[PDB]
């Protein structure tokens, strides 16, 4: 369901933006979690570009530089 996929999410930061952030933090803390962040909102939050348009071509360039 629409709350299931929000919880079951690799982007733990987006789950932190979603409800029961405490449970997300406990699950990541016992996970030892490390995230290539895969998306939009967390990258807004960290203040890089969004891989969406022009930013998606820039992230094409960014993956091409590595």
């Amino acid at each position: 369901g629409i709350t299931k996929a929000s919880l079951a999410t690799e982007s733990f930061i987006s789950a932190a933006s979603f409800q029961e952030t405490t449970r997300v933090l406990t699950e990541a803390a016992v996970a030892g979690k490390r995230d290539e962040l895969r998306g939009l909102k967390e990258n807004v939050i960290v203040g890089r570009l969004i891989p969406a348009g022009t930013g998606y071509a820039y992230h094409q360039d960014r993956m091409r530089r590595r």
């Binding site: 933090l25 939009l40 203040g47 890089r48 969406a52 022009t54 930013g55």
Partner: protein, 1316 residues
């Protein structure tokens, strides 16, 4: 007969059903609550003395001491109302309470006291009221909102629906204590009862029946009846009533006296029941194993050994039958448990119970109340007696016990506040019966289940909180009672009392602030009942039904007045003719109806007795004695609207307008339009802003007079007199001799209210309206207040209106605007911004006041005085330095941004002990001489009245008028005159003269002191000087205006005369509205307003024609008589013959601009009456007259309805709504722009538009917004460098708030970090 003031401008009445009742006084609620609150009154209920009798006397710990009540008293407040409002104090009076102590001796329970002592001890102050009822806290007038809550007491509901999906309703008996803990009941789907206290756990009440020391047999005796089997000769025959046989199927062949009646397998009909009751046979032979299904009612111990054969709460079996049979217990008691009639609930509820005695019940209760303590005997006992048996901890009021007795169909209406066992048991019996299938649950939404509290009630509650605090403190300190030296203030502490009353009137949702933009808004801020507050529910957990209206509100609660949005149907206000029960309910008038005659009385009715009767509607065509022309009529049975017979009814609706409130009352044409826009227009009329120049509406309703009277905005003449002297600031009225006092002469001297500041920064002001030398009336207005037009209440204005499109300037709510209106200046608002300037003592010394202002412009210095303050009368611009307050090294008082004004007033408040400078002392002496001249002229005109009474004495009794005036006024008493009550009246007035000497001296010296004395301030500040500005605002294209029809609008563009369409006379229209706004937003009554005002204005134009082009009283007499007769059934009842013919000149000047036309709510006019006025006018049938363009000059095809609309202006002025910020100051915790306008704040950029940007590919845009322009200081400094260089290049760096949150999680026990 009518008023001589009403002879100035009469209103054309409309109304066809005659009235039997006028409008009563509207502000009775607050006055009665507060007056029953404070009064030296016996018998307790209700008010302060109830709380005193509850709290007093206060005795020792049998330590030979008792403090008893005597009385209380309050003197006057130390100050006035007005300078107190200027000052910032409550208008409160010294609570001086008479209290006597008695202290006994060693072995003196009844013996002699050793000491008595009594004093009238002070304890805080409580606020007195305005005669308009309200309170003022600290220069700020706030209003106590009375709170709707439920009824305290027992209630029976089911709470069906979403309970366990079993298709099974529940049942809950719910008791609401007036003061105490919650106590409700609850069942199972498995059909066993439980109980809780204050939303706690699910445990039965049979354990508390054990705690009330009842055996199982006693409990079954309580809640059940008996069925008797007996050990007998053979097969142990049953005692039987055939009513117990009802609704059953015959388990065996029902037989009696060897005769067969009902076969085995037959269901028992009532036929065979009445046949066997004709037979009347109890004892019938039963099979031995059928009784095994029965459950025994009592215990049966053995006879020989005394040992338990079998106990109660136990079904049977034949081995048990032999065991009791070999003992031979010839009585066997069981319960009639017919599973449809009587469910076996209580027996199995006892089967659940693990506890046995009263003591295990006590231990379980004492554990479940406070888990975490060891069980204790006496602590459990004290706990149980403190649950619902303590007068300290549990009570219901007289209303609570009365509604409790109402629930039980009793006779005695009164009782205690603590419970009895009988109470609880009978409530349980009723609950069992509701479980069985008899009885009906009731909604909360019935108004009799609800109750509005009063101001005196909740004030008494807070007062009781203070009382129980201070008596705990006293009984503490009476254990510390030191003999022979304690006085009745040595244990006092009014600081809980003062803290409680200040926290109440300072911090309460119900104590909220008055809306000063409208007399009507002030009175509906008074007339307001909420569903919130202490004991109120929460809006986020309230359903529809508690918000949606119930038919009990009919005639009691106005259905069309509520705020929308977050609080809908919860702030519902009172109607017009509704009143208040003694018991907190809504008594309401009804015209009593006999067999065929309406009794002319009213009678007040409860909510529940409305179901008893059937009420006739007001539009029922009686014939002159109540002779209604039908015998069937639309009425309601129990709010049950259908057609009913004539002999059925006994009551009638009093008014056709009693169903609504006063806000709806001024709104005409309601019967044609929808309540959405009607409620919105009522809201915006509450949102109205005062104008400059008052002018009456043309469509009145008659309600305007009593509302303008009851609103305190003006001077109602408390006596009837003759006008003596008029000024713009005060008016002297000479009292007529009939209402005149016998001694102590006096004349009516009333002071106006001039240009002064509202609570909403507008111009509250009073204006005179009468001539000098004029007969007036007791109980009549004397001068117009704010937005009041000649004894009437006139908020908005009316202008030349029509309906057509014009170039999209009536696009959705766009407003076409003529230049003529902004020429006529008739919507200019006047606003008052007040600022202060404090003088705090801070570090490195305080900050000064004078004009030593370095390194600034000399223009702002030259406006100042020598003392550092700009002079009064000074038109100032934005940013102008007002008071120089330099910093020890400048923080001078300055004009805010975007505002202009003119200096009008200085108020100075300086801490006591601080030297005032030359400006403060100078304006102090100015106001001193001002009030000095005030009191002197009061004394002198009272002196004029006094020696005029002396002259009136010497009209008789040896009159020597030439020998009167030669010697001065003093010895006019002792001239040639008898030794009678003439000369004794003169002696009374000479004692009054010496009294005026002494009184004037002491009042003048007290005023000298009160002006002279230093002002109490906060610690740290030294003086505070208040500043007053004259702000004028006319209009600008973009603000928000409307009318009385939910017709919101925005002025689009000021437009010249040469854009306005004009008639064949050439007269240009002012404002044109949308045709399309009419059909969709269904408010058709504005067209009726348009036609009616158009016809009335044409009448007034013909009046002004006959006025300007002059003409005698006869032709105008004919015209005005034909105007005021006007067709259908009227109650105008005036004639032109009884007039002075010069008031007709005055009333023609009143009619030269328009005609006052009264309009009932649901007895509104008809279209034939409109066409009658149009024919009486010079005006056509439809009124769609052709016009011609201001630009093209052609006839508009399909001509437009033109006319007037009494439009409304709002307090949405876009200068206080336009706000922009290129770059301002930043927040501290995150270096980010703030919000608001006072704080020069930026626009919040929410996330919905972030998602909108996500629908685009705004990569650079989003990045420069959220990083540079919000968070990073480096990015915004480099972007600043880019703009001052013209460069366009950014680097984000890092969001600081991201790092803030990351360090917050690092402050949590979290190894969260950032890798390479």
């Amino acid at each position: 007969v009518y008023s001589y003031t009403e002879k100035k401008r009469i209103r054309k009445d409309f109304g066809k059903r005659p009235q039997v009742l006028d409008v009563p006084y509207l502000l009775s609620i607050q006055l009665d609550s507060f007056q029953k609150f404070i009064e030296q009154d016996p018998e307790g209920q209700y008010g302060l003395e109830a709380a005193f009798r509850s709290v007093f006397p206060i005795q020792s710990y049998s330590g030979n001491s008792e403090l008893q009540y005597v009385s209380y008293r309050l003197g006057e407040p130390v100050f006035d109302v007005q300078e107190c409002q200027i000052r910032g104090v409550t208008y409160s009076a010294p609570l001086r309470v008479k209290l006597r102590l008695v202290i006994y001796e060693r072995e003196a329970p009844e013996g002699t006291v050793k000491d008595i002592k009594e004093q009238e001890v002070y304890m805080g102050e409580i606020p007195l009221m305005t005669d308009n009822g309200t309170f003022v806290i600290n220069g700020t007038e706030r209003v106590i909102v009375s709170q709707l809550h439920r009824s305290p007491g027992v209630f029976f509901d089911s709470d069906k629906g979403k309970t366990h999906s079993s298709g099974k309703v529940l049942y809950n008996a719910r008791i609401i204590p007036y003061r105490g803990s919650w106590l409700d009941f609850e069942f199972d789907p498995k059909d066993n009862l439980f109980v809780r206290i204050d939303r706690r756990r699910k445990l039965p009440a049979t354990i508390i029946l054990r705690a009330l020391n009842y055996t199982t047999e006693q409990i079954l005796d309580l809640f059940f009846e008996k069925v008797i089997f007996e050990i007998r000769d053979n097969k142990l025959q049953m005692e039987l009533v055939p009513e117990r046989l009802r609704g059953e199927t015959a388990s065996f062949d029902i037989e009696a006296n060897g005769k067969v009646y009902v076969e085995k397998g037959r269901r028992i009909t009532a036929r065979h029941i009445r046949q066997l009751e004709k037979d009347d046979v109890k004892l019938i032979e039963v099979p031995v194993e059928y009784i095994a299904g029965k459950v025994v009612a009592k215990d049966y111990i053995d006879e020989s050994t005394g040992e338990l054969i079998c106990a109660a709460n136990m079904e049977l079996s034949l081995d048990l039958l032999a065991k009791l049979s070999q003992s031979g217990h010839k009585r066997i008691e069981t319960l009639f448990t017919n599973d449809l009639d009587h469910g076996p609930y209580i027996s199995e509820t006892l089967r659940v119970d693990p506890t046995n005695d009263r003591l295990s019940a006590l231990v379980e209760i004492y554990r479940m109340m406070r888990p975490g303590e060891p069980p204790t005997r006496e602590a459990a006992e004290s706990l149980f007696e403190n649950l619902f048996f303590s007068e300290d901890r549990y009570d219901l009021s007289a209303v609570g016990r009365m509604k409790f007795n109402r629930s039980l169909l009793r006779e005695e209406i009164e009782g205690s506040g603590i419970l009895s066992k009988d109470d609880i048991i009978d409530v349980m019996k009723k609950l069992i019966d509701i479980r069985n299938g008899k009885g009906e649950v009731d909604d909360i939404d019935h108004l009799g289940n609800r109750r509005i509290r009063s101001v005196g009630e909740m004030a008494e509650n807070q007062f009781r909180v203070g009382l129980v605090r201070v008596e705990r403190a006293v009984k503490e300190r009476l254990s510390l009672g030191d003999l022979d030296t304690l006085m009745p203030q040595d244990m006092i502490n009014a600081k809980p009392i003062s803290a409680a009353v200040k926290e109440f009137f300072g911090s309460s949702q119900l104590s909220q602030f008055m809306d000063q933009n409208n007399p009507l808004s002030e009175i509906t801020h008074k007339r307001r009942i909420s569903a919130l507050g202490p004991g109120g529910l929460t809006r986020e957990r309230a359903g529809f039904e508690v918000r949606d209206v119930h038919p009990t509100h009919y005639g009691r609660v106005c259905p069309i007045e509520t705020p929308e949005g977050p609080n809908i149907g919860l702030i519902n206000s009172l109607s017009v003719y509704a009143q208040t029960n003694e018991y907190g309910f809504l008594e309401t008038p009804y015209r009593k109806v006999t067999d065929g005659v309406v009794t002319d009385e009213i009678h007040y009715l409860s909510a529940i007795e409305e179901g008893n009767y059937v009420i006739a509607q007001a539009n029922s065509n009686l014939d002159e004695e109540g002779h209604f022309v039908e015998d069937l009529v639309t009425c309601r049975s129990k709010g049950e609207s259908s057609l009913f017979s004539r002999d059925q009814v006994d009551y009638m609706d009093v008014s056709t307008q009693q169903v609504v409130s006063v806000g709806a009352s001024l709104i005409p044409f309601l019967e044609h339009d929808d309540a959405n826009r009607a409620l919105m227009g009522a809201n915006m009329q509450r949102q109205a802003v005062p104008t400059l120049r008052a002018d009456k509406p043309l469509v009145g309703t008659g309600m305007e007079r009593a509302v303008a009277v009851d609103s305190g905005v003006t001077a109602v003449a408390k006596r009837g007199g003759v006008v003596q002297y008029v000024d713009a600031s005060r008016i002297v009225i000479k009292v007529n001799e009939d209402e005149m006092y016998p001694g102590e002469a006096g004349i009516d001297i009333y002071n106006l209210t001039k240009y002064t500041r509202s609570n909403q920064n507008t111009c509250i002001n009073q204006m005179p309206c009468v001539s000098l030398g004029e007969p007036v009336e007791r109980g009549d207005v004397l001068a117009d207040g704010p937005s009041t037009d000649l004894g009437e209440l006139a908020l908005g204005q009316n202008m030349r209106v029509a309906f057509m499109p014009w170039n999209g300037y009536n696009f959705e709510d766009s407003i076409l605007v003529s230049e003529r209106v902004v020429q006529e200046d008739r919507f200019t608002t006047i606003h008052i911004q007040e600022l202060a300037c404090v003088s705090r003592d801070t570090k490195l010394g305080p900050e000064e006041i004078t004009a030593d202002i370095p390194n600034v412009g000399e223009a702002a210095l030259s406006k100042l005085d020598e003392s550092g303050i700009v002079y009064i009368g000074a038109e100032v611009t934005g940013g102008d330095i007002l008071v120089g307050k330099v910093t020890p090294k400048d923080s001078s008082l300055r004009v805010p941004n975007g505002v202009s004004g003119t200096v009008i007033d200085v108020q100075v408040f300086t801490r006591d002990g601080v030297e005032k400078d030359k400006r403060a002392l100078e304006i102090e002496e100015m106001q001193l001489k001002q009030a000095k001249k005030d009191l002197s002229e009061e004394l002198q005109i009272l002196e004029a009245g006094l020696f005029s009474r002396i002259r009136a004495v010497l009209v008789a009794g040896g009159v020597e008028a030439e020998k009167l005036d030669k010697l001065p006024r003093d010895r006019w008493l002792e001239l040639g005159l008898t030794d009678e009550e003439k000369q004794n009246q003169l002696e009374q007035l000479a004692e009054q003269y010496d009294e005026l000497k002494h009184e004037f001296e002491k009042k003048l010296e007290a005023k000298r002191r009160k002006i002279t004395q230093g002002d109490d301030l906060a610690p740290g500040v030294l003086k505070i000087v208040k500043v007053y500005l004259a702000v004028k605002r006319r209009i600008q294209p973009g603000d928000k205006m409307a009318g009385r029809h939910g017709n919101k609008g925005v002025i689009s563009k000021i437009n010249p005369i040469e854009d306005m369409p004009y008639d064949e006379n050439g007269t240009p229209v002012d404002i044109v509205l949308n045709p399309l706004g009419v059909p969709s937003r269904m408010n058709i009554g504005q067209i009726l307003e348009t036609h009616l005002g158009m016809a009335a204005k044409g009448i007034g134009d013909k009046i002004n024609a006959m006025l300007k082009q002059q003409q005698e009283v006869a032709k105008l007499r004919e015209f005005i008589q034909r105007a005021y007769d006007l067709g259908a059934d009227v109650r105008q009842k005036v004639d032109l013959s009884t007039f002075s013919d010069e008031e007709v000149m005055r009333l023609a000047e009143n009619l030269r601009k328009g005609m006052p036309i009264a309009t009932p709510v649901f007895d509104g006019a008809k279209e034939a009456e409109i066409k009658e006025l149009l024919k009486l006018g010079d005006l056509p049938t439809s009124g769609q007259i052709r016009l011609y363009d201001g630009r093209t000059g052609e006839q508009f095809e399909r001509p437009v309805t033109v006319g007037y609309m009494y439009m409304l202006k709002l307090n949405h002025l876009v200068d206080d709504k336009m706000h922009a910020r290129s770059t301002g100051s930043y927040s501290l915790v995150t270096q980010q722009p703030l919000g608001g306008k006072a704080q020069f704040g930026g626009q919040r950029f929410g996330e919905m538009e972030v998602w909108a940007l996500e629908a685009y590919g705004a990569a650079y845009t989003l990045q420069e917004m959220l990083t540079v322009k919000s968070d990073d200081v480096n990015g915004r400094t480099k972007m600043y460098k880019n703009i001052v260089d013209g460069n366009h290049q950014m680097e984000p760096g890092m969001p600081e708030s991201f790092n803030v949150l990351l360090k917050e999680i690092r402050s949590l026990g979290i190894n969260i970090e950032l890798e390479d």
